[PDB]
């Protein structure tokens, strides 16, 4: 009773409004919601050697390649620049504060509960449970940890350099910003950090969106309960979903696929008798060996250039994404944003940053209206 059916896509549920002359609608209740957002910040650095790749430990092939000029000095500067840009990308997003703040010893924030985001000292890595889940959900391919099977098949001049900022001091930055934004409000984003009780800060955040502080000062218990429930269920939503961190996985997989293709391109004749240098030297004699080696060399150059050609565009896109992430971190975290549909859906309240493998995750807190009634207005 199962089949494949082709239909016409439906835009959405049909709805109508009841616009008139003297009718208005006003909600009598609200609801706090917590969404999530994933942004890549960087990609894996790499370095490629011409001599080992094009002409494997052979003197004649290297001598012939020398005649071509500076087609490999050009292919190192681009990769070094890409590596420098990748190293700089992670600094702008995270290294925003000047000092590192400590969380207070006693954890009581007027009913608000922050155990899911605060660091857990029991674990050796000192990472939050959500941070640990995000770290475990993403499978890394290579990290350059003195590996000495596919990665071991890359003794062809291809290496992966490790990032300058390890994923142990990034968590320190995340904890510093989160402690600063939960113990001083937004005052530490401009000048010195000034202490303020959390309920007063939340009351001012409500006053920012045009709702007087008495709403909070009379519904504190309900607001705290809703915040706790949302924070609890966001972890379950992240865990039970099939695949939410798809962008980071795609970024990880693209470089691996490109490297695998580049390795496999060595197994090409390129219009030659064979694809191995030792045989084509031993069997032949230097006259025609020069022509065949020139064919192989030009084929390998043509295959190698496209790699950096695509890497430049990928680096540009990743840099644009990193700039967007840095702007978002500056605006949603270190202040309240009045931009519509920028820092989550709905009226913005505040945000929390988290670190993910090769990226960042934002936890926006938003205010949404609820059941409404009509009235007659003049």
């Amino acid at each position: 009773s199962q089949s494949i059916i082709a239909y016409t896509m439906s835009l959405g549920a049909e709805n109508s409004v009841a616009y008139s002359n003297n009718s208005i609608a006003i909600p009598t209740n609200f609801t706090i919601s917590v969404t999530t957002e994933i942004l890549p910040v960087s990609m894996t650095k790499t370095s490629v050697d011409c001599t080992m790749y094009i002409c494997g430990d052979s003197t004649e092939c290297s001598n012939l390649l020398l005649q071509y000029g500076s087609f490999c000095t050009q292919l190192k500067r681009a990769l070094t620049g890409i590596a420098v840009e990748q190293d700089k990308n992670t600094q702008e997003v995270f290294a925003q504060v000047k000092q590192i703040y400590k969380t207070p010893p006693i954890k009581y924030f007027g009913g608000f509960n922050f155990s899911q985001i605060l660091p857990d000292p029991s674990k050796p890595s000192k990472r939050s449970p959500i941070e640990d889940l995000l770290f475990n959900k993403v499978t890394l391919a290579d990290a350059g940890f003195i590996k000495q099977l596919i990665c071991a098949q890359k003794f062809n001049g291809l290496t992966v350099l490790p990032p300058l900022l390890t994923d142990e001091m990034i968590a320190q930055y995340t904890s510093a910003l989160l402690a600063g934004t939960i113990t001083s409000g937004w005052t530490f984003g401009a000048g010195p950090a000034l202490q303020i009780p959390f309920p007063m800060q939340m009351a001012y955040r409500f006053n920012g969106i045009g709702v007087t502080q008495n709403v909070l000062y009379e519904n504190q218990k309900l607001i705290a309960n809703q915040f706790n429930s949302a924070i609890g269920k966001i972890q379950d939503s992240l865990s039970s979903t099939p695949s939410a961190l798809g962008k980071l996985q795609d970024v990880v997989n693209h470089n691996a696929q490109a490297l695998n293709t580049l390795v496999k391109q060595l197994s090409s004749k390129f219009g030659a008798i064979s694809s191995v240098l030792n045989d084509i030297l031993s069997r032949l004699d230097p006259p025609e060996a020069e022509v065949q080696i020139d064919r192989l060399i030009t084929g390998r150059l043509q295959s190698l250039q496209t790699y950096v050609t695509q890497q430049l565009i990928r680096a540009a896109e990743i840099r644009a994404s990193a700039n967007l992430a840095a702007t978002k971190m500056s605006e949603c975290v270190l202040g309240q944003s009045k931009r519509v549909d920028f820092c989550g859906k709905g009226y913005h309240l505040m945000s929390f940053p988290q670190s993910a493998p090769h990226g960042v995750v934002f936890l926006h807190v938003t205010y949404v209206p609820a059941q409404e009634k009509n009235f007659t207005t003049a």
């Binding site: 001599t51 003195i146 590996k147 000495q148 290496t159 496999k264 045989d279 031993s282 032949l284």
Partner: protein, 380 residues
């Protein structure tokens, strides 16, 4: 080296990549099959009764030590053009099987024995493959095969229904069905005999004189060796960066005992690069392994050259209980093997660093290294 990699006499503070390092091979080994008999090459060239083109004699050769350097004085060798296998680079190879085919043809048609050629001889008598590798040898034979009356000893086929596949014999005494009449052995009008003559006489000039040809077809492919050249094998060394000559397979690396399951019909091992990974011993039949020697890049950490002339080298992704601590001549590509390598030694996740002492202090770092590690110039 840093001053040389970028054209200037002053280098600014920072880290620069200069070149690559890799250990060098120490000794070379060769291992070939141990065959003593000499397979005969005299009679294939030296025979007086080479068969005709429509049925050419084929000689197969087997285990021997073929010396391809004595046959040159066996014939004038009018044409000695060889295909992909170099004629001079032929005494140092190993082949699976070798074949020789012997026949005599008209000299004018000598050029027609080649891949991708049709005509008369190459469409009904003898065909070669397009990707043939080997040699051909053709020379004049008018001195012997010459009759004052007529040399009616060699024949060829004129009429056939379809072209034959390469390397195929099609001997047959039939009658061709030319025209509409299905002749049944009359061999008269409109039904001619498929075979004609090779009347060779000294009166005719060049091209019409008989030409004697012999073709050699090789089997240079991945298979157990049967025919090899005259070279003397040596002993096996293991766990050392050496160069090997395994049955015509030339390369370098470290050989160690492996745990593979090479079946009796398997001789070579492969990964996804079209490069060999495992090899079988030609004369002991033990499964070996091949691993490329250690290699990596070099980074030089230097302050301002106007401040000091001291540098610290970094080897990337090389764990230096290995050759960086045990350094010797003719073992490192950088000729500058002149560091102590016993003092000022640090191990780092991004490859171990030589030339710096760890200090438990912590400041803002000037020259990044990696893995949360930085280097800087500092007083006592």
């Amino acid at each position: 080296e840093t001053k040389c990699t970028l054209k200037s006499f002053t280098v600014e503070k920072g880290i620069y990549q200069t070149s690559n390092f890799r250990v060098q091979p120490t000794e070379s080994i060769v291992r070939f099959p141990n065959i003593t008999n000499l397979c005969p090459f005299h009679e294939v060239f030296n025979a007086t009764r080479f068969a005709s083109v429509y049925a050419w004699n084929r000689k197969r050769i087997s285990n021997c030590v073929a010396d391809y350097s004595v046959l040159y004085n066996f014939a004038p060798f009018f044409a000695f053009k060889c295909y992909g296998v170099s004629p001079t680079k032929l005494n140092d190879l190993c082949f699976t099987n070798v074949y020789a085919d012997s026949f005599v043809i008209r000299g004018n048609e000598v050029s027609q024995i080649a891949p991708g050629q049709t005509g008369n001889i190459a469409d009904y008598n003898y065909k070669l493959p397009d990707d043939f590798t080997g040699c051909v040898i053709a020379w004049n034979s008018n001195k012997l095969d010459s009759k004052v009356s007529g040399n009616y000893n060699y024949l060829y086929r004129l009429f056939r229904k379809s072209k034959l596949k390469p390397f195929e014999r099609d001997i047959s005494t039939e009658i061709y069905q030319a025209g509409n009449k299905p002749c049944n052995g009359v061999a008269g009008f409109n039904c001619y005999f498929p075979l004609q003559s090779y009347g060779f006489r000294p009166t005719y000039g060049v091209g019409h004189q008989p030409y004697r040809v012999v073709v050699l077809s090789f089997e240079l492919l991945h298979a157990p060796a049967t025919v090899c050249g005259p070279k003397k094998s040596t002993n096996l060394v293991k766990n050392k960066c050496v160069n090997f000559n395994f049955n015509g397979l030339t390369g370098t690396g470290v050989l160690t005992e492996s745990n593979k399951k090479f079946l009796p019909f398997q001789q070579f091992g492969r990964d996804i690069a079209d490069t060999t990974d495992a090899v079988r011993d030609p004369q002991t039949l033990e499964i070996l392994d091949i691993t490329p020697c250690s290699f990596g890049g070099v980074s030089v950490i230097t302050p301002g050259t106007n401040t000091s002339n001291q540098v610290a080298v970094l080897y990337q992704g090389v764990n230096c209980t290995e050759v960086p601590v045990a350094i010797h001549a003719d073992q490192l590509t950088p000729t500058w093997r002149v560091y102590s390598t016993g003092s000022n030694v640090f191990q780092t996740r991004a490859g171990c660093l030589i030339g710096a002492e760890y200090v438990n202090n912590s400041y803002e770092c000037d020259i990044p290294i990696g893995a949360g590690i930085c280097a800087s110039y500092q007083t006592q």
